[PDB]
Amino acid sequence: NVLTVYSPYQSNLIRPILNEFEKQEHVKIEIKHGSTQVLLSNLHNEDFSERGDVFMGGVLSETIDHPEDFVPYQDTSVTQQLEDYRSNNKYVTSFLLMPTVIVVNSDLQGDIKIRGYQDLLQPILKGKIAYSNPNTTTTGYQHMRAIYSMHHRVSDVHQFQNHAMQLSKTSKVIEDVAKGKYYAGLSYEQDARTWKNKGYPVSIVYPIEGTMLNVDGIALVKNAHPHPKRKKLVQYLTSRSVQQRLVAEFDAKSIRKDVSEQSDQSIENLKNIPLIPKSKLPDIPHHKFLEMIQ
Amino acid sequence: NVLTVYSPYQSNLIRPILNEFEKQEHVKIEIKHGSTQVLLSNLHNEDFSERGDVFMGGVLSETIDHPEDFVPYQDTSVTQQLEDYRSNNKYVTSFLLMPTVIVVNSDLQGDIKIRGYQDLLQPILKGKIAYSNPNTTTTGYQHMRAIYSMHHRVSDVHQFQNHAMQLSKTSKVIEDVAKGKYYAGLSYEQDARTWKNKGYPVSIVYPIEGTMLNVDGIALVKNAHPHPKRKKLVQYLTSRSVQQRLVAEFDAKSIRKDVSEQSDQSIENLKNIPLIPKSKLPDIPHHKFLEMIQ
Amino acid sequence: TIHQHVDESQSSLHHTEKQIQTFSTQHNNSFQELDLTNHHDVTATKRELLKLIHQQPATLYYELSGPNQFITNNYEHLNTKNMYLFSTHQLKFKNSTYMLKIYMANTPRLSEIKKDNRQFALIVDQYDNILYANDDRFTIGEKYRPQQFGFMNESVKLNHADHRLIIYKD
Amino acid sequence: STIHQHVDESQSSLHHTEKQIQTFSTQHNNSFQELDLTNHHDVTATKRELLKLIHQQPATLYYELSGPNQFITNNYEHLNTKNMYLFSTHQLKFKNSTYMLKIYMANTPRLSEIKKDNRQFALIVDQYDNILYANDDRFTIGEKYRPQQFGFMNESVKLNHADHRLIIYKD
Numbered sequence: 001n002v003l004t005v006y007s008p009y010q011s012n013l014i015r016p017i018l019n020e021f022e023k024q025e026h027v028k029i030e031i032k033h034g035s036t037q038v039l040l041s042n043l044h045n046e047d048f049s050e051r052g053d054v055f056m057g058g059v060l061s062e063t064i065d066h067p068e069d070f071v072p073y074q075d076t077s078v079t080q081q082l083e084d085y086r087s088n089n090k091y092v093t094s095f096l097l098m099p100t101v102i103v104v105n106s107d108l109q110g111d112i113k114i115r116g117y118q119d120l121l122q123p124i125l126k127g128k129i130a131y132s133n134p135n136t137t138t139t140g141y142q143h144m145r146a147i148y149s150m151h152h153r154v155s156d157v158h159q160f161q162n163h164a165m166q167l168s169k170t171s172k173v174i175e176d177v178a179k180g181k182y183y184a185g186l187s188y189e190q191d192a193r194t195w196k197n198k199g200y201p202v203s204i205v206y207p208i209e210g211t212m213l214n215v216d217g218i219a220l221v222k223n224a225h226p227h228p229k230r231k232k233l234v235q236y237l238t239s240r241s242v243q244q245r246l247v248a249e250f251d252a253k254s255i256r257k258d259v260s261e262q263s264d265q266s267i268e269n270l271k272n273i274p275l276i277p278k279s280k281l282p283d284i285p286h287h288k289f290l291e292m293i294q
Numbered sequence: 295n296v297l298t299v300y301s302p303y304q305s306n307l308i309r310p311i312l313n314e315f316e317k318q319e320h321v322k323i324e325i326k327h328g329s330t331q332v333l334l335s336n337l338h339n340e341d342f343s344e345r346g347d348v349f350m351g352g353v354l355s356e357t358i359d360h361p362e363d364f365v366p367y368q369d370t371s372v373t374q375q376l377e378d379y380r381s382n383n384k385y386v387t388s389f390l391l392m393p394t395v396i397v398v399n400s401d402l403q404g405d406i407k408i409r410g411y412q413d414l415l416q417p418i419l420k421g422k423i424a425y426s427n428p429n430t431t432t433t434g435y436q437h438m439r440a441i442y443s444m445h446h447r448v449s450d451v452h453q454f455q456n457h458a459m460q461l462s463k464t465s466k467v468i469e470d471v472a473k474g475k476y477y478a479g480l481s482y483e484q485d486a487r488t489w490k491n492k493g494y495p496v497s498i499v500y501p502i503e504g505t506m507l508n509v510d511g512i513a514l515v516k517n518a519h520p521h522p523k524r525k526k527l528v529q530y531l532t533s534r535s536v537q538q539r540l541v542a543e544f545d546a547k548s549i550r551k552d553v554s555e556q557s558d559q560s561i562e563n564l565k566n567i568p569l570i571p572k573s574k575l576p577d578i579p580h581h582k583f584l585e586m587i588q
Numbered sequence: 589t590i591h592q593h594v595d596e597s598q599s600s601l602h603h604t605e606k607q608i609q610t611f612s613t614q615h616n617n618s619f620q621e622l623d624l625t626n627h628h629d630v631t632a633t634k635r636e637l638l639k640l641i642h643q644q645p646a647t648l649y650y651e652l653s654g655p656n657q658f659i660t661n662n663y664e665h666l667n668t669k670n671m672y673l674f675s676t677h678q679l680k681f682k683n684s685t686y687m688l689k690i691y692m693a694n695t696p697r698l699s700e701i702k703k704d705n706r707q708f709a710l711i712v713d714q715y716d717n718i719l720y721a722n723d724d725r726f727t728i729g730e731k732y733r734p735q736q737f738g739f740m741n742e743s744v745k746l747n748h749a750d751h752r753l754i755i756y757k758d
Numbered sequence: 759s760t761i762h763q764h765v766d767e768s769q770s771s772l773h774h775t776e777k778q779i780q781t782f783s784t785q786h787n788n789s790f791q792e793l794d795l796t797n798h799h800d801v802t803a804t805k806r807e808l809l810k811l812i813h814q815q816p817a818t819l820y821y822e823l824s825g826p827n828q829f830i831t832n833n834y835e836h837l838n839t840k841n842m843y844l845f846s847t848h849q850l851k852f853k854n855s856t857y858m859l860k861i862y863m864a865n866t867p868r869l870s871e872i873k874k875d876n877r878q879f880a881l882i883v884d885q886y887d888n889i890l891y892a893n894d895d896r897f898t899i900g901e902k903y904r905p906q907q908f909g910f911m912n913e914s915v916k917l918n919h920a921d922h923r924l925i926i927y928k929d
């Protein structure tokens with residue numbers, strides 16, 4: 001009866017929505033949290049009979065190294081999703097738009113200008129900025145792609161990594177930046193706002209050289225006995241009412257054309273964020289890009 | 295080593311000042327709490343060797359039935375205390391002035407007029423007013439004397455008792471009035487202000503027919519091994535800085551002309567309280583009054 | 589014993605919930621004549637609510653909300669998120685409808701068995717959502733996972749909803 | 759796993775945290791005398807030193823630097839410091855005025871873990887039995903701990919920086 005969900009999302013974002021699906025469909029949902037690639041790798045070595053049902057979170061349409069671990073499915077509401085961000089992956093359904101951000105501690109910043117990836121290389125900031133492991137996380141990997149996309153130089157990726165402290169967990173970056181251990185860090189929008197809204201001195205910066213936008217996805221996991229409500233769960237997560245609740249209660253950016261954005265404060269709307277255009281995005285596959293920058 | 299204090303006061307009133315005496319004189323003070331007469335009766339049956347050192351609180355100068363349990367002392371601070379309220383009792387030193395009050399629940403009152411004891415006899419209030427045991431408490435006993443002082447009629451005392459619910463503990467009266475179990479109750483000023491200051495719908499009424507003023511006292515307890523610092527404690531409790539702190543931090547009414555009588559925010563200073571004059575106060579001794587109203 | 593305490597609290601909670609429902613039904617006609625923009629009718633309503641509160645053993649807090657009113661006996665403004673939401677009613681008054689919420693902060697029996705017996709209490713729904721707790725290691729709104737703990741525990745189902753009362757001892 | 763082992767480990771951890779504060783105050787006496795906290799750059803420099811001090815030790819610490827025109831703190835969630843252990847108080851000479859520095863401990867990983875995993879709670883009391891820290895809801899900071907009144911399995915040790923005792927106990 002239990003429907004198991006793999007998710008790199010923080011519990012504060014998805015547990016309320018999943019609790020409502022539990023009550024509507026009379027099913028208990030258990031979540032496995034962890035870094036995106038750690039969840040995917042453990043899923044790959046997990047035997048067919050014991051696997052969960054749904055994977056939600058992370059840039060699944062571009063970082064699933066083992067597509068044989070998933071079942072082709074496509075949400076019937078695709079025709080209501082923004083055309084720039086619909087899934088080209090048979091195995092993935094687009095779910096949310098998540099900008100990757102630089103978080104800056106405003107108590108520590110002072111006169112140090114931090115407007116993008118180039119400002120982070122100032123010698124004053126050496127060893128005082130943090131990021132998460134690009135081999136195991138969506139956030140760390142997407143940021144390395146954004147750094148590479150600046151001038152298409154692997155040296156820029158290596159220069160930053162030799163300038164910053166690598167952490168194991170993406171959420172450890174925002175916690176230690178907000179609490180004053182680091183001057184700045186590489187995070188994502190929803191995590192940054194969670195700590196800023198609690199009163200921490202967190203400034204959210206969209207890198208001026210080009211902000212990487214994450215198209216978060218949902219995928220059905222290939223298992224022996226799929227839960228009969230897992231496709232209904234995908235419909236629920238991509239439905240208008242649920243997407244409208246994610247934008248209203250959690251300031252998320254919806255995947256659907258019908259649901260309106262809500263930024264006002266803090267910042268920003270999607271149109272006002274200097275996103276990396278779809279034509280400048282590196283087309284190197286996930287595993288190959290990671291080995292190239294090793 | 296430990297200086298033991300008997301006191302009917304609430305901990306919130308005397309624990310802070312006694313804590314400061316602990317640090318000033320390097321001594322541990324333990325408080326034994328209870329109703330005034332219960333403390334005195336248990337003190338009387340308490341074995342000579344195990345008795346405490348100091349009794350503070352209650353109208354000691356008029357309700358100590360066993361004077362043989364105490365030791366005479368004279369505070370060197372009397373010359374600075376109000377002349378109407380100094381102790382003529384060999385064993386007692388005056389400490390504080392405590393008006394007895396009627397507490398009214400402002401959520402329940404409505405149009406019911408409650409300005410004194412006579413208003414409490416309205417048939418709509420039958421069984422909806424509370425008071426504490428006059429045989430065991432200072433507050434209940436002093437209120438019964440105040441009711442008797444109206445027309446010097448035992449029938450007025452019996453009429454009220456047949457109209458009200460008697461509780462064992464004085465502080466249970468204010469708690470149950472504040473929480474809405476009773477429309478009104480017979481309490482004392484400091485207890486009433488404690489619950490009013492916490493946000494409870496408590497109106498403090500000084501009976502219009504004559505408010506009974508309590509002269510709270512301090513007495514040294516006759517024991518085998520008196521603590522060497524207890525007379526210093528009596529001087530401390532009647533000292534100017536301590537009386538000034540009791541007025542400033544706890545809104546008490548000082549016994550001393552010396553302390554500036556700061557009366558505002560909630561409820562009266564002494565001049566504006568319709569106190570029972572010295573000529574209308576019953577001079578019947580404590581035990582004899584209790585048997586007379588039995 | 590835990591078993592004895594589980595039976596007593598479930599019976600006390602079931603009684604308390606029946607008295608609330610009996611209160612609302614018997615005051616349906618009375619409330620429809622009371623206009624809560626009038627100070628007399630507010631007093632009359634507060635009197636009935638406070639009378640109901642003190643007919644039950646549990647520590648209950650009411651919240652009567654509408655256009656002109658937020659009427660409550662939570663005078664110290666305790667956080668109702670840390671309380672058990674026990675009933676919700678939409679009441680018809682003369683001038684408007686009003687929402688009545690009744691929260692349970694504790695019961696004298698549960699507080700006593702916590703103090704004297706170190707027996708704590710949980711209330712969870714059928715999806716393991718924590719709806720009440722008097723132990724700080726559990727937060728209302730989070731999930732209870734019984735496999736994560738090894739305490740002696742016994743559970744009983746409450747009548748008014750698909751909720752389970754769990755009394756346990758570490 | 760035992761109370762005995764945890765009291766030793768917690769006492770060592772608390773001594774280390776306090777020694778970092780004492781070394782910080784001793785080593786920063788002359789440095790602060792050159793900083794004027796009405797200048798925003800000197801405020802930034804002071805915040806950088808305070809936040810750097812916080813992250814050299816394991817415990818969850820909150821500082822309060824108060825004076826004329828200033829109340830500087832890392833208690834961004836506005837937690838109630840009355841429910842925290844007052845850990846040190848210093849009067850510091852800055853260029854423009856004296857400023858009081860208070861350091862509070864809301865918790866430490868050693869005490870938090872043994873509470874979760876072992877149901878072992880922690881008290882810090884002074885020589886007059888005043889409760890200075892507690893992570894058990896039946897005890898309130900500011901009230902008296904009366905030992906004679908409980909049956910707990912417990913072990914106690916004295917902390918170096920004050921006449922305070924750390925008590926770890928279990929039901």
Ligand SMILES: O=P(O)(O)OC[C@H]1O[C@H](O)[C@H](O)[C@@H](O)[C@@H]1O
Binds near residue numbers: 007036059214
């Ligand atoms: O820990 P991670 O692998 O970085 O995943 C945590 C979050 O980071 C990314 O930025 C994605 O936008 C989110 O969908 C994901 O939940």
Ligand SMILES: O=P(O)(O)OC[C@H]1O[C@H](O)[C@H](O)[C@@H](O)[C@@H]1O
Binds near residue numbers: 302304351430
């Ligand atoms: O419980 P009780 O005997 O009424 O004593 C509680 C208080 O009531 C009286 O009014 C006295 O003025 C106080 O000194 C005393 O502490």
